[PDB]
Amino acid sequence: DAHKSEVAHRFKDLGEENFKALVLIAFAQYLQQCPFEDHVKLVNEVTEFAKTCVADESAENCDKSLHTLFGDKLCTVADCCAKQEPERNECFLQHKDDNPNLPRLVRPEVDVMCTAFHDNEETFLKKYLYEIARRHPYFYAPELLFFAKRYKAAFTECCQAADKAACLLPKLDELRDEGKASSAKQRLKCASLQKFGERAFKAWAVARLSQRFPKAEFAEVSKLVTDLTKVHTECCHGDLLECADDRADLAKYICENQDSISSKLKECCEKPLLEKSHCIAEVENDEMPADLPSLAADFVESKDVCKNYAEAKDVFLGMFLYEYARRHPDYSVVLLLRLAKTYETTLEKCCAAADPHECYAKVFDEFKPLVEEPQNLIKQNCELFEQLGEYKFQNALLVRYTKKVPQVSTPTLVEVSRNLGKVGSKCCKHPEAKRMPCAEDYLSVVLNQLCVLHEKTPVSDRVTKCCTESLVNRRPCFSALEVDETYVPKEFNAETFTFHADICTLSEKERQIKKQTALVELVKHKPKATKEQLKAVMDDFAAFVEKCCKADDK
Ligand SMILES: O=C1CCc2ccc(OCCCCN3CCN(c4ccccc4)CC3)cc2N1
Incomplete structure (x- = not known):
């Protein structure tokens, strides 16, 4: 009932609907370029084969491993397909692209989306899964199912609202925000496993869960850590069916032993299946038991x-x-x-x-x-964040880190420096007791994003050194890099600083990202430019952006 045919065991444990979604996610994360319709066709063939195994475990090929089955299907469409089953999956994981050359998704009109939702609900929700999974090949798969459920509920409610856009847009925007944060958080888990090993992962898990479940005995903490490590090892290795299945098992075990784990789980454990695991994974720390000896x-x-x-x-x-x-x-x-x-x-x-x-x-x-x-570093950065605000704070990071490593690509500099500035928005609003876990753990996540982005296109031996050394020492290592002295500035290209009329149709946020992009390109062209020479340019560019459009002359 759980041994002879693995694909049948997981189909029974998860049910058809989650099975098909998890398989679609796995296919989109391995082959990020293949069209949507092709992947759906492969998923349907895998699902119809899984049904025969459920009906008869001894039917032909039902005894094969999930990787053999999933690898075979993918290889019916990049040297990985000439490899035997163990090495083949490892070749697939190696080729996952952390920033694939895909066009960003343009959200259509709300009426256009709601009409597509009602036209074919099944296809609408599958495309959502597919586009997210192929752009985030390490997204936590069971958590993506939960996002998809919220995505569907948002369309179900809001497309019946009198004002569709006023209802839907805020729900989609926070889903996008939560999805980006979840992706980066999971990417750090997979990077630590792959680059530093299980012992490092389990230590991290022991620390965090002991903070979160301080009343539990050490034997209880160790048991939870062991099971959580198996979950993430499977998910990061592409064993998505096992990962989802084991995660539901873990949530079911936690909820049946609340009394020896935490007093914070009562509500989480009354929620449905997907919400329960999500709720448990982000529950507040329990109060620590009193009179604990030193x-x-x-x-x-x-x-x-x-x-x-x-x-x-x-x-x-x-x-x-x-x-x-x-x-x-x-x-x-x-x-x-x-x-x-x-x-x-x-x-x-x-x-x-x-x-x-x-x-x-x-x-x-x-x-x-x-x-x-870390206490002083956070206390000093939060003050600077309060004097400047997020956007100016981001700009100050942009110039400093561009001078330190001018060889990093402008999209990476912009993305990473923007996220390093968001730490102040997220964490400085807490008291001193909560600032350090908030700030330092968020810094680990964003610095890891820098490391994986740089690993994609390496340009600096010093960034590689900080990224491959101790995970716990990354933030000190990056801070001490020093300005690159031997970098010869790039010749001034006027086409970079030539804005078209399309800039005024963008959202305000995108225009601010474009201004930050020109600021990095400015520093690269003149690395020894002072703060006033850069401020005079950015203030002039900002003034020209508002001017050349508030006046109707195209
Ligand atoms: O894009 C790139 C590539 C080039 C590069 C090289 C080095 C580098 O070092 C960053 C080291 C951590 C900096 N933190 C420290 C503290 N942190 C903070 C902010 C608010 C509140 C509390 C804390 C702000 C930011 C970044 C980059 N970036």
Whole structure:
């Protein structure tokens, strides 16, 4: 019922509707260029074959692995198809394009969308899945099903509203916003798994879940981490059916053991299937249990620290991280991992010393400068964010980071510097207790986006170094890059700074993105230009943009 035919097992577990969507997502993420209709046809053939296996597990080919089945179908349409089943899937994952040369989707008129929704609802919702999945080849697949459900509900409600556009546009805009943030967050999970391995992933998971579920026992935290790691390993490896199935299993287990996990899950666990998993994944930290003793008695002052550590290294350090993380919801996850790495380093050298107890007696003192550094960086950047506002703050990042690495492409500089500025909008509104996890964890996400974008088209050996070194040290490494001195400026191209009448039909947001694009190209043309020389240009360009259109002369 769960062994002889894998494709039948997952079809039964997930049901036909989610099965077909997850297969469509997998096909769109592997072959991002193939047209929509072709992928649908392949999905339908896979689905009709899966049904025969449900009817008879011993039917021909029903015993094949999902990768063999899915790989075979894709290869009926790029050297990957000449490879045997293990190496073949790895070749597919390697060719996923993080920024494919696809035209951005132009949202049509609201009436045009609602009429297409009512014409063929099935095709409308499949195209939505397809266009998102092929542009975000690492999107968290079960979470994409949840976005699709909200997308459908928005059209179902608003296309019946008296004012369709006033109802629909705000729901679509926040879905797009939430979808971009979810994509970047999941991309970081897959990058850490692929580049730094499962041990690094599980440590991150131990830290975050201990902060989120501080009342749970270490055995409970470890069990959840193990299952969550399998979920994301499957999803990041393209095992989307297993990933969705295991994620629903995990949500079902969490909800059946609330009493030993958290007091924050009552509401989440009354929601339907897709909403429940989403709700659980973003539930607030539980209150930490009171009267929790200090870590000193068992991790510093104890005489059996070296003995307990040597008997089980990874378990002891995992226990340390769990105990420290549950006590510090106010620390970022990268800080908590750095502190746990410090403890391990101290233990390795001190347990070999002549007097181990004296050697590691002051290990917690070494945490003080590690804690203070991100606290001051955030306190200083939030002030600058308050003096400038988001758009000016983004501009200041644009010039500084363009000078540091002028070889990075202008779209990457614009995207990344804009997202690094949004940290202030997202996090500086919190108190000091919440700023650091908000800011530092958001910085990890956006810096990872820079790393994957640069990995696509490498130009700087220094960016590669920061990206391939310690994940927890990325933000310090990027901050210390220094201005590139040997960069010879590009010859001035007037076609770059020549705006057409089409600029005034764009939204205000797009025009601000175009101004930021010209600002980067300005710095590249004159890297030693001062702030007043750049401000005089941008203020002149902005004035010319408003002028040459408020006056009707085309
Ligand atoms: O596009 C590129 C490519 C070239 C490049 C090289 C280095 C680089 O370093 C960024 C290092 C982190 C900077 N943070 C630090 C703090 N962060 C903040 C903002 C508000 C509130 C709290 C915190 C602002 C931004 C970025 C880029 N960008």
